[PDB]
């Protein structure tokens, strides 16, 4: 953010180590609930990942 | 004023100026604010930040 640095997130990747390449490819959702910017501790969806 | 027990003589009482004696009145002085003020002028403050 411009104006005060709090850096409003936009995505979250997970890293592929070489012990977890099974694992990760085993997950299709992904449900999320976090702090939003004017709201409060809403829950957003369970969309698909986008890899 | 001159009290005096027991009978007393006087004569020849003068008064006379000698010179000027200096002083000094009422100013708008050193106005060192406090201690506290200055810690409730920094009470509102921002960190500007490099991303």
């Known amino acids: ?4 640095g709090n850096t409003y997130i936009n995505g979250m990747y997970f890293a592929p180590t070489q012990t977890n390449k099974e694992a990760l490819d085993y997950i299709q ?11 409060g501790f809403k829950d957003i969806g369970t969309k698909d990942k986008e890899m | 004023t001159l009290i005096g027990s027991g ?20 100013e708008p002085e ?7 003020e200055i810690m409730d002028a920094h ?6 930040l490099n991303f």
Not at chain 2, 30 to 36: F, H, R
Request: hydrophobic share 30%.
């Open chain 1, 1 to 4: 953010n411009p104006s005060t």
């Open chain 2, 30 to 36: 050193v106005k060192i604010p406090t201690d506290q």
């Open chain 1, 29 to 39: 959702k992904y449900r999320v609930e976090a702090t939003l910017q004017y709201s």
């Open chain 2, 7 to 26: 009978t007393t003589y006087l004569d020849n009482l003068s008064i006379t100026e000698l010179n000027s004696t200096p002083e000094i009145l009422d």
């Open chain 2, 43 to 48: 009470k509102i403050y921002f960190a500007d």
